[PDB]
RNA sequence: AUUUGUGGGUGGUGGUGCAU
C-alpha cells in the first residue's frame, strides 16, 4: 500500500508538472502570437540612444607584431623517467614474447 | 515613458522567460534582437528575474545576432548582475551550469568579454570566490590569443587586487603570446610590486598571496625568454626581496637558467 | 577570411574522518 501510494504520488506530481508545463506553453504561445508583434512595433517606434579598451588594443597590436613562447613542460624526476622507460621496455619485451608465443 | 502595450508585452515576455527553463523561445524573444532599442527592451522586460537556462539562451542569442558594442554593454550588465545574484544566492558561492555556459558564450564573444565584462567585474571588485570561478572558466575555455594577452597586459598595468592577481595567474597558466610590450607590462607590474629602497609604496612593501606566488612561478617558468638580461636580474632581485620558501627556489632557478630575448 | 592538415594536454565547480 505504501508503494502504491508512492506510485500515486509520483503520478500526481508528474501530472501537476505537466499541467504547469502546459500552462507555460500556452502563455508562451499567446506571447509569441500577440506580445511579439506588439513589442516589435513598440521597439520600432521607440529609441534607446575607454582607457582599458585602448590598452587592450595596444597589447593586441603588440602581441600580433611580436611573439615569444617557450611553454616547457614540468621536468619529472630522473628516477621516475628511468622507471617509465623501463616500463616501456618491459611492455615491448612482453609484447615481443607474446608475439613469439601466441 | 514606455507605452502600455510595450510594458505589457515586455512584462509577459519576462514572465515567460522566468517560467520557462526548456522548450522553444517565443517570437518576442526571437524578434527582440532584430531591433535597435535592445537596451530599452531589456529594461522594460526586467531580465533580472529570468532563469539560468533562459539567461544562457538569451546570451547565446545575443552573441549570435547582436553587434559588438551593444552586445558588450548588454553582456556586461546582464552577466554581471546575474553572476552577482547567483554568487549571493549560493551560500557557498557556487555557480550554475547554464550561467557557466552563458559566460562561455560571452567569452567566445571577444569584444564583449575583456572590454565589457571582465574589466567591469574587476572594477566592481569581485570577491576571491568569484575570482577563482573566473580563473576556472578562463582555464576551461580559452579565448583568442590577442584578447588573452590584452587582458593579461591590462591586469598587469592595473593595480594589485585579488581578482587582478587571479586573472594574471590564469593568464600565466594559459600561456598565450607574450610580446615585448606584454613582457614589459609584466615587468612593470613586478617592479611596482617590488620594494623601492627612495619613495616606497603599499604595493611595493605589501605581502603577496599564494596565488600571486604561483603566478610569479609560472611566469618565471614560461616567459623567461621574453625577459632580457636586465629584466631577469630585476626578477631575481624581486625574488630575493619578496620571495618565498618553496615556490621561490624554482622561481630563482628559472630566472637564473632562462634564456634572454 | 573564425576554421582547416599535423602534434597535444585529460581526473577533480570532489565525498572525506579528526584536530584547530
How far does CA B86 lie from the centroid of its chain?
17
Burial A36-70 (b: 16+ CB within 10 A, else e): bebbbebbeebeeeeebbebbebbbebbeebbbee
- CA torsion sign for A74, A80, A86, A87 is negative
Distance from CA of B223 to the nearest CA of A (A): 7
Residue with cell 567585474: B121
Percent of residues in chain B assigned helix, strand, coil, to nearest 5: 75, 0, 25
Give dist(CA A102, CA B238) in Å, integer.
63
Give dist(CA B148, CA B168) in Å, integer.
10
Interface test with B, best of A21, A48, A51, A76 (most B CBs within 10 A): A48
How many other C-beta atoms can be found within 10 angstroms of the C-beta atom of residue B247?
A: 16
For B9, the closest of A38, A48, A57 (CB atoms) is: A38
How far apart, in Å, do the first and last CA atoms of chain A sit? Answer: 61
Could you tell me which chain B residue has the CA closest to the CA of A47? B37
Give the closest nucleotide to B96 (alpha carbon vs C1'). Answer: C13
Cβ–Cβ under 8 Å, residues B261 and A68: yes
Cβ–Cβ under 8 Å, residues B78 and B58: yes
Cβ–Cβ under 8 Å, residues A62 and B181: yes
- CA proximity to B193, closest of B207, B179, B214, B183: B207
Residue with cell 582599458: A52
Distance CA B193 to C1' C8 in A: 35
Dihedral, A74, A79, A80, A81 alpha carbons, nearest 10: 70
Distance from CA of A6 to the nearest CA of B (A): 27
Cβ-defined contact of A68 to B36 (cutoff 8 Å) = no
Among left, alpha and beta (phi > 0; psi -120 to 50; other), residue B166 is: alpha
- CA proximity to B14, closest of A44, A35, A22: A35
Cβ–Cβ under 8 Å, residues B59 and B102: yes
Q: What's chain A's length in residues? A: 102
Which residues of B fall within a CB distance of 8 Å from A26? none
Cβ-defined contact of A32 to B37 (cutoff 8 Å) = no
- CA torsion sign for A80, A85, A91, A93 is negative
Residues 63-122 of B with CB under 7 A from strand C: 94-97, 99-100, 108, 110
Resolution (A): 3.8
For A55, the closest of B28, B153, B223 (CB atoms) is: B153
Query: Which residues are CB-contacts of B39 (< 8 A; sequence separation ≥ 6)?
Result: A48, B70, B73, B74
By what technique were these coordinates determined?
cryo-EM
- CA proximity to B179, closest of A61, A56, A52: A61
Amino acid at each position: 500500500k505504501k508503494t502504491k501510494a508512492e506510485v500515486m504520488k509520483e503520478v500526481i506530481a508528474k501530472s501537476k508538472f505537466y499541467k504547469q508545463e502546459r500552462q507555460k506553453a500556452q502563455g508562451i504561445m499567446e506571447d509569441q502570437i500577440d506580445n511579439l508583434d506588439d513589442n516589435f512595433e513598440d521597439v520600432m517606434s521607440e529609441l534607446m540612444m575607454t582607457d582599458l579598451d585602448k590598452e587592450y588594443d595596444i597589447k593586441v597590436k603588440e602581441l600580433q607584431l611580436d611573439k615569444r613562447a617557450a611553454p616547457s613542460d614540468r621536468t619529472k624526476t630522473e628516477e621516475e623517467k628511468n622507471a617509465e622507460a623501463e616500463e616501456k621496455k618491459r611492455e615491448l619485451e612482453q609484447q615481443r614474447l607474446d608475439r613469439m608465443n601466441g | 515613458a514606455l507605452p502600455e502595450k510595450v510594458i505589457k508585452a515586455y512584462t509577459t515576455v519576462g514572465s515567460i522567460l522566468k517560467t520557462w527553463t526548456h522548450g522553444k523561445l517565443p517570437k518576442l524573444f526571437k524578434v527582440i534582437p532584430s531591433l535597435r532599442n535592445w537596451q530599452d527592451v531589456i529594461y522594460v522586460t526586467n531580465p533580472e528575474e529570468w532563469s539560468p537556462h533562459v539567461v544562457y539562451e538569451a546570451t547565446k542569442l545575443f552573441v549570435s545576432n547582436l553587434t559588438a558594442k551593444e552586445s558588450q554593454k548588454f553582456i556586461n550588465l546582464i552577466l554581471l548582475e546575474r553572476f552577482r545574484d547567483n554568487i549571493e544566492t549560493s551560500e557557498d558561492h557556487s555557480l550554475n551550469y547554464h550561467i557557466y555556459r552563458a559566460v562561455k558564450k560571452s567569452l567566445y564573444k571577444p569584444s564583449a568579454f575583456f572590454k565589457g565584462f571582465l574589466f567591469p567585474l574587476v572594477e566592481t571588485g569581485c570577491n576571491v570566490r568569484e575570482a577563482t570561478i573566473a580563473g576556472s572558466v578562463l582555464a576551461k575555455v580559452s579565448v583568442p590569443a590577442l584578447h588573452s594577452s590584452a587582458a593579461l597586459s591590462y591586469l598587469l598595468r592595473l593595480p594589485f587586487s585579488p581578482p587582478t592577481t587571479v586573472f594574471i595567474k590564469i593568464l600565466l597558466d594559459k600561456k598565450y603570446a607574450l610580446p615585448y610590450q606584454t613582457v614589459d607590462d609584466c615587468v612593470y607590474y613586478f617592479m611596482r610590486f617590488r620594494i623601492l629602497d627612495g619613495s616606497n609604496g603599499e604595493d611595493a612593501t605589501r605581502v603577496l598571496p599564494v596565488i600571486w606566488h604561483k603566478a610569479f612561478l609560472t611566469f618565471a617558468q614560461r616567459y623567461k625568454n621574453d625577459i632580457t638580461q636586465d629584466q631577469r636580474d630585476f626578477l631575481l632581485e624581486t625574488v630575493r626581496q619578496r620571495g618565498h620558501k618553496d615556490i621561490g627556489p624554482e622561481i630563482r632557478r628559472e630566472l637564473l637558467a632562462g634564456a634572454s630575448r
